[PDB]
Structures are given as structure tokens and as C-alpha cells.
Amino acid sequence: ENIYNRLGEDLNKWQALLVQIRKARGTFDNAETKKEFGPVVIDYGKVQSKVNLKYDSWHKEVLSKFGQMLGSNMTEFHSQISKSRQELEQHSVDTASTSDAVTFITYVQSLKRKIKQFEKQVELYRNGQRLLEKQRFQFPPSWLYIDNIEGEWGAFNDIMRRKDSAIQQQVANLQMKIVQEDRAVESRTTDLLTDWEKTKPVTGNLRPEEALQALTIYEGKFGRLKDDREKCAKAKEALELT
């Protein structure tokens, strides 16, 4: 508990621990059992074997911890592949719900870094798990083996970059769609400006309640126009190519 708390969560540090304990055991290696000094004889081998077994048990139990976060990276793998299948099948150049599309498009860029992140984790992992077999692990089927998953991650990355990039390039149609959409938004904005100038009920002769209802209708359609303008602007900045 003490050493684990001091280490905390650090995989590379953990690999350093393992190489350190391995080299410590190796340096401990000896054959003599009794260092006689002068006429004085001392047992040396009994405690030698005992502490060697202590090292072995300690090193083994230390190894035992890592499998759990290995399961973590496993779940990361799974969550990636099972869901990325659906997500690649999802979007298309058409489907003027492009906003959501470009939303996910922005999403996938946000993922790219994490990809590299996960990738290097896998690299660290693919090193530590190697120790696992030369530390003689009983890899229980329970967990995926090598590319058992891996291969699947490589497949994942390649499939993402094959099609997502392409569909990102075919966006000029979406670009001009956004262009005409915002143009219609500006036209409706000018129309609503003119309607507001016409509709000014500022005169006191009008009944407060009826003109209130008319202003409520105006405000409903005005909030609708505001929603249109803000959604067009946010789609523009999310797509950010236009």
C-alpha cells in the first residue's frame, strides 16, 4: 500500500519499478551460503533464500496490479471500435442536417489528438504487456491478447482517415448551402427590420392587450429569426472553412 500510494497512477514509472526490481533480483544472485570472516562463520544462505522468495512474491504481486488498467485501455479500444463503426456509417455529404454532421466533424478533429494519445498509451502498453509474458503471466482468455484488439485499432484508424478526410474535402456543396442559408437569414433580418419599423405600436390609442398580443407574435417570430441567425453563425464557425 505504501509503495503503491507513493507511485500513484503512472505506467512508465511502473515499468521503471519493474526493471528496477528485476535488476535488483539479478544483482542479488549468489551461490555461496556462508561468508566466513577469520575464525567466525555466519549463516548467509538461509536468509538469502528467504529474501529472494520475498523479492519474488513482491515482484509478482506488483506485476499483478497492471492488468486492471490494461483492462481500462481494452475498454477504450472497444468503445472506440464498436461506436466508430456506427459513426462512420452515420454521416454523408447530403442530409442538410449538416450542422450535426459538421458537429460530429468537429468532434472527430477533437478526437484526433486523443487518437495519438491513445496510440502512445498503446505503445506504452505494448511494451508493458511484453514484460507480462517475460514475467510469465497467465494471460487468462478473459482479456484480449495482442492485435487481438490492437489489429482492430489499426483498422479503426485507417478506416477513419480513409473516408472522414474525403467527406471533409467534399464540403463546397455544404459551404454554398451555408452561404445561401445565411443570405436568406439576412434577407429575413432586413424584412423583420422593416416589419418592426412598420409595426411600432408606440401610439397610445391602440388597446394595450391587442397590441401586446401582436407584439408577442412579433417577438415569437423574432426569437425564431434570432435562433436561425445564431445557428447559421455557429454552423459557419464550427465548419470554420467558410
Binding site: 471500435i81 464498436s82 463503426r85 494471460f139 482468455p141 478473459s142 482479456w143 484480449l144 491478447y145 495482442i146 492485435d147 487481438n148 484488439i149 490492437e150 489489429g151 482492430e152 483498422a155
Partner: protein
Amino acid sequence: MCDRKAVIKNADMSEEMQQDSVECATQALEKYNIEKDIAAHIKKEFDKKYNPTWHCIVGRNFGSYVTHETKHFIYFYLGQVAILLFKSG
């Protein structure tokens, strides 16, 4: 029982179906001595189990490159036997 560790080598499938593969292939290797027969038993069992269609190879020296259905592929080792099982069809 001869404890032949099953090295689920490469895979696009769930963990339960891979362990079912390991168990079924261990059973086949205990039951038959012919690689063609091992592959036949494994393929027939999985055809009965997860609905067609699979392709299974059992052997010592073979290299492969195919297309399978997603979540429906495994390749592993039992003892000195490499076993590939992928679904495409």
C-alpha cells in the same frame, strides 16, 4: 485436461464469442486429429451458434488475408495449432 493456452491472437469480436471459440476449438482438437476435420467441426458449431456464414482454418503453416464481417473475426493459437475463424457472407 491438457492445458493448451489459447492465444486469441488477432480479433474483431466480443470476449464471450472468443472464449466460446477457444472452448469449441479445444473440444475439436480433443475430438479429431485432422486439420480439415477440426475446421469443419468448429465452422459447423459456430454456424449453428451465431448464424451463418463463417470460414475456419486450422493448421501449422499458413498465411492469410481476407475480409470478414465486423465483430465476427478471430485468429488464435491452441498448443501448436493456429486457428482462424472469420465471418463474411
